[PDB]
Amino acid sequence: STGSATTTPIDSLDDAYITPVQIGTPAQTLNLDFDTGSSDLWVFSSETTASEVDGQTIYTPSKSTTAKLLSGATWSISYGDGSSSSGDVYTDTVSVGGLTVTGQAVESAKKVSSSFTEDSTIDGLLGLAFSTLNTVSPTQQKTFFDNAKASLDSPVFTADLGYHAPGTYNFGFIDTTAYTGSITYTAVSTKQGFWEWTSTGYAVGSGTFKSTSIDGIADTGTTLLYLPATVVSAYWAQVSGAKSSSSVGGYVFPCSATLPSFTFGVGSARIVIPGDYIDFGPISTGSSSCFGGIQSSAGIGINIFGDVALKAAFVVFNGATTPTLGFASK
């Protein structure tokens, strides 16, 4: 089997991407944030504290004839940005782009933090990291991809995120029309439960390529590109007036600037992020100070190849017995 679904930016800055997902019988369609940096499929629901729901579409298990309470099971997740959610668990039928999994753990939120409430466009998350990170207790549950994998034509999914435009998540096949040149594959460590890999280096603008190993994760659920402070300083040094602002919480730059590109290495291959992809707009409405899309990972403990990096590429998440990651230009 295969599946194919369109993923759409939630706003004009590409802060995140939502993909429609059919849950239950009859189908309830929710728009979920596909997140290769986590492993829980959780949704706003009829159980979510009412004051914490503000415009989201909810899953109502009582209206699904295929929903079954997973007795005794609870979940609770915190993300790096300080957001969180928790609740109980049902199993139900879940379909993405024509690909159907029966008995999928659907984690129903009883509580969500303010950042989720405030985002009316995101109805939940669909995790696509390794199932070892799944938070369900006392019986850990599998991701949608893990459940689907044996049935897929090939045990892979791909992320093709757009810049200010829709893109595509595919399951079970590689669309050879969706990228240019060849896909370069690189090793993955699953030891931390992430799609963790090592970039071979970077360049800033038309500058020389610096060969240096940068260990990090391919994370569709993180907006920005978080890299070591040395690398980030080298980038912003090429933008006149750019500075790190503690009060804003990162690098900002004059909105009048033209940003240089940023290149990252995948083996001997190179992915070029255009300057425009690194612009996240005014820090507040009407400001002439703009927020940067490349930020230091120094306070995080891991480097993160988030949407800013991934949307510059066609990315293959290869879930073979030994997983690997593939990157192509597009």
Ligand SMILES: Cc1nn(C)c(C)c1CC(=O)Nc1ccccn1
């Ligand atoms: C790890 C991390 N530290 N910091 C400062 C950031 C911003 C992250 C990434 C992160 O939190 N991503 C996320 C958020 C919500 C849902 C899914 N992914």
